Amino acid sequence: LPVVFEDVVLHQATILPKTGTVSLEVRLLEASRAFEVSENGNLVVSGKVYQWDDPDPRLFDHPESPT
Amino acid sequence: LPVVFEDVVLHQATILPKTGTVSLEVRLLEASRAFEVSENGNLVVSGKVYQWDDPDPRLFDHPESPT
Numbered sequence: 001l002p003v004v005f006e007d008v009v010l011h012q013a014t015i016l017p018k019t020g021t022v023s024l025e026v027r028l029l030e031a032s033r034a035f036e037v038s039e040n041g042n043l044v045v046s047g048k049v050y051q052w053d054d055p056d057p058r059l060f061d062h063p064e065s066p067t
Numbered sequence: 068l069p070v071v072f073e074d075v076v077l078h079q080a081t082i083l084p085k086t087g088t089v090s091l092e093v094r095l096l097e098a099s100r101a102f103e104v105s106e107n108g109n110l111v112v113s114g115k116v117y118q119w120d121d122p123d124p125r126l127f128d129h130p131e132s133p134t
Contacts, residue, residue: 027096031105032113036096043098 002055008047069122075114081106
C-alpha cells in the first residue's frame with residue numbers, strides 16, 4: 001500500500017513509561033481522507049492520509065545537490 | 068444536550084428517492100471535535116460539533132431591530 005500524508009500536525013508528545021503501556025487509538029474518516037490519533041481522549045496527531053493511486057518513481061530521483 | 072455546531076459545510080445535496088431509501092452515515096472524532104456525514108462513501112456535511120459546557124440564556128435575547 002503506497003500512502004501519502006498531508007498537513008500532518010503533532011500536538012503533544014507522548015512519553016513511554018518504563019513500566020506499563022500507553023494505548024493509542026486511531027480513527028480514519030475515509031470520505032474526507034483524514035485521520036486522528038488520540039491518547040485518553042487528548043489529540044496527539046492529526047492530518048490527512050490516503051492511498052497513492054498512481055505512483056511515480058520519478059519523484060524519488062535524487063534532487064540537484066545544494067553543493 | 069445543548070450543542071454547538073461550528074464551521075459546517077454542505078458539499079452536495081442528497082435527493083430523497085420516491086421509492087427506496089438513502090442511508091446516511093455520521094462519524095465523530097471527539098478529540099478533534101469534528102464530524103462527517105457520508106452518503107455511499109461521498110462526503111456530504113463536514114464541520115465541528117461539541118457539547119455546550121455552560122449554556123447562557125442571554126445569548127437568545129432578541130437583538131434590537133435596526134428599523
